[PDB]
Ligand binder design. Structure first.
Ligand SMILES: CO[C@H]1O[C@H](COS(=O)(=O)O)[C@@H](O[C@@H]2O[C@@H](C(=O)O)[C@@H](O[C@H]3O[C@H](COS(=O)(=O)O)[C@@H](O[C@@H]4O[C@H](C(=O)O)[C@@H](O[C@H]5O[C@H](COS(=O)(=O)O)[C@@H](O)[C@H](O)[C@H]5NS(=O)(=O)O)[C@H](O)[C@H]4O)[C@H](OS(=O)(=O)O)[C@H]3NS(=O)(=O)O)[C@H](O)[C@H]2OS(=O)(=O)O)[C@H](O)[C@H]1NS(=O)(=O)O
Lengths: 517, 104, 103
């Protein structure tokens, strides 16, 4: 009661090959659903179409979500990681919950009184067996804020199950979170928890300096021929023939290659200048969307592909990018100066542009009378010989995602970026233990529905150790570093304004340093 | 599985990720080209951002167990999905793995 | 230039603040940072012990030196003492250069 449970550690430590980023924050937990598990469906949320239909449950539990890069790295630390390392991956995590206070608010006569209840507890358990629906990795809100000065409130845990419209099917499951071994904590008690990440590939935080279709020696020809000429060129009567040429420094497009660009699933190309777009509502009609059990879902951000070709910054794939929102930006139909559209153009070297055909394939058998026809390949699954890069990471974006427990998954790297994990950091769930108001003086079999209004607060630390892969570039000229532009501004970037509101002006990725292909 | 691969979110929280929501100013009389972005939420579960995609496909023809609902033609071989190998066609059967029908 | 000891590593700055304690949050999740706090302030004691090295005066001068002394004349109130209202006041600025030494 009169002794702190922990201290405030919120700094990074660089040990050459690794970096340990600690981050403490203050949280607040209200009582959700008034301590009840309520069944929710698309009909309770005000009904919807069949594509938006759902069936799940709300629970009285809140959960901690530190699955974003800005909860761990400061804008400076991120820049020191982005400009010097070629890859990075997390090694171990260490979550701690302390300095717990369970305040009891009693609203009597318009006058609000908040007093601490020293004997009240909170339950907090971590599902280490992944027996509960994993909700993190869906890019939801409620993360430790990016700025350490502010306090956040803990999001409410709710899960979904199978549905047939707004109804439940036979296999729909109901999970009671009270059926797990929680750990009651009064003020004075603390919660410590450690976790060590499985072996996941380093995140390639570099761009390639060579294009996958220009990996030859521009001074030498090949010893391999290709159909160069099919028709004797002129006379007056040019006829059918067969001429073969050797690929050379002038026919780089016709040369023979060993590899192919990564897979594709074509996207619609919209312009940031609305005057260049067709005047129709194609936000849903012209979108690329997978079909699953009769209902359509937006492929967004979809698999990994370049945003635009050379010199076309104005164009972005309709769904193929991560769009973050500037500070304070609303929720609905916000305009384009209220969001920050990421630019995945550094992978145009290996991955095909999201808004263009993958290739062209012959669709018939040319003959004396039939001539050579060809089609455009919009969707192209992997093939032996393909090579591609994964989506970037974004200091504001997600860190990991749980690889779904299926018996088949190809290249389980999350489409939103990050590290795909089969055993991701577990979900730390926490709620305020109910404290009933004065019960009747005569026995009533009915469950007590009157409770003492309370909420808890306290601090939370999260230490993560990251393994780095230092850059050993033997390049001669200088590289492209991330730098704060030297020009004078009204307010510093990644700093608080004159009202104390912290804001991240732009989305920072990792691909700055270059490397050969 | 008791969860659908396209419903692995928290139905109480919105996302911090936006998506092209509106492309045309809605009404006036003269609705024109614009660009509006919304945040995926518990009501737009279809527009939210996902990390995964459904397994691969090789589409099949759909026949009804009640023969009165099927087209009156001999498509047992003509309307079948079949791979080509060395000049000869073979029935893809049972083929790769896919669900038989939708709900109901 | 204002006097004192120039130090490359001076006593560090001890910074202190009251840790925020949020007022009752909404019963529905709002992504916005909490701006309502419980009004509080802290008090307590603070000690600061400093050890000073001295350099005693070894003057071999013959006549008396100039010492700092409270003038013997009677006043209304003692110097460097509280007045009749409990308000402590330092009447004049006292320097160190009193003792003399050769050049
Ligand atoms: C939409 O369908 C309609 O059009 C398509 C094509 O158009 S499209 O692409 O724009 O859609 C037609 O489909 C194409 O043509 C088909 C067809 O003509 O039947 C068919 O062609 C393939 O098979 C044909 C017959 O082969 S056979 O082995 O079964 O006989 C063939 O044409 C025949 O060529 C042979 C040949 O050249 O050998 C001819 O045989 C003659 O010579 C042989 C050897 O000669 S030799 O000198 O003695 O050595 C002799 O052994 C033989 O006895 C002799 N026959 S004889 O009766 O003339 O005496 C034979 O006569 C020809 O019919 C095609 O080859 S080709 O030579 O015509 O180029 C062969 N395809 S190919 O070799 O790859 O070109 C295919 O289904 C299809 O082929 S395609 O090239 O891909 O297009 C479709 O039929 C038509 N149907 S419709 O809409 O209903 O009208």
């Amino acid at each position: 009661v009169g002794n702190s449970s922990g201290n405030w550690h919120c700094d990074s430590t660089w040990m050459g090959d690794r970096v340990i980023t600690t981050s403490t924050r203050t949280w607040a937990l209200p009582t959700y659903n008034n301590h009840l598990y309520k069944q929710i469906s698309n009909s309770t949320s005000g009904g919807s179409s069949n594509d938006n239909a759902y069936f799940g449950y709300s629970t009285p539990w809140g959960y901690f979500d530190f699955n974003r890069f800005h909860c761990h790295f400061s804008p400076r630390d991120w820049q020191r990681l982005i400009n010097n390392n070629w890859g990075f991956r997390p090694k171990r995590l260490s979550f701690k919950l302390f300095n717990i206070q369970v305040k009891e608010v009693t609203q009597n006569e318009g006058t609000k009184t908040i007093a601490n209840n020293l004997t009240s507890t909170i339950q907090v358990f971590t599902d280490s067996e992944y027996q509960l629906p994993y909700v993190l990795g869906s890019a939801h809100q409620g993360c430790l804020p990016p700025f350490p000065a502010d306090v956040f409130m803990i999001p409410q845990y709710g899960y979904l199950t199978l549905n047939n419209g707004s109804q439940a099917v036979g296999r729909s499951s109901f999970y009671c979170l009270e059926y797990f071994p929680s750990q009651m904590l009064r003020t004075g008690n603390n919660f410590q928890f450690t976790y060590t990440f499985e072996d996941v590939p380093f995140h390639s935080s570099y761009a390639h300096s060579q294009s996958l279709d220009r990996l030859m020696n521009p001074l030498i020809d090949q010893y391999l021929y290709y159909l160069s000429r099919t028709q004797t060129t002129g006379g007056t009567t040019n006829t059918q023939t067969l001429g073969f040429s050797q690929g050379g420094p002038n026919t780089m497009a016709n040369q023979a290659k060993n590899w192919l660009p990564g897979p594709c699933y074509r996207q619609q190309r919209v312009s940031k200048t609305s005057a260049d777009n067709n005047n129709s509502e194609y936000s849903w009609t012209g979108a690329t969307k997978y079909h699953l059990n009769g209902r359509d879902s937006l492929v967004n951000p979809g698999p990994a592909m370049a945003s635009h070709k050379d010199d076309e910054e104005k164009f972005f794939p309709q769904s193929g990018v991560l769009i973050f929102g500037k500070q304070g930006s609303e929720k609905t139909n916000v305009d384009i100066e209220k969001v920050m559209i990421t630019d995945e153009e550094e992978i145009r070297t290996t991955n095909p542009v999201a808004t263009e055909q993958y290739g062209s394939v012959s669709t018939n058998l040319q003959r004396g009378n039939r001539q050579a026809a060809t089609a455009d390949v919009n969707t192209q699954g992997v093939l032996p010989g393909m090579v591609w890069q994964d989506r970037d990471v974004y200091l504001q974006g997600p860190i990991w995602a749980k690889i779904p427990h299926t018996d088949g998954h190809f290249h389980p790297s999350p489409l939103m970026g990050g590290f795909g994990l089969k055993h991701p950091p577990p979900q730390i769930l926490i709620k305020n233990t109910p404290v009933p108001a004065d019960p009747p003086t005569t026995f009533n079999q009915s469950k007590l529905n009157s409770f003492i209004t309370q909420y808890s607060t306290g601090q939370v630390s999260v230490e993560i150790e990251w393994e780095l892969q230092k850059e050993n570039s033997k390049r001669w000229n200088p590289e492209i570093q991330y730098t704060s532009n030297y020009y004078k501004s009204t307010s510093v970037d990644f700093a608080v304004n004159t009202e104390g509101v912290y804001s991240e002006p732009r989305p920072i990725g990792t691909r700055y340093l270059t490397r050969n292909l």
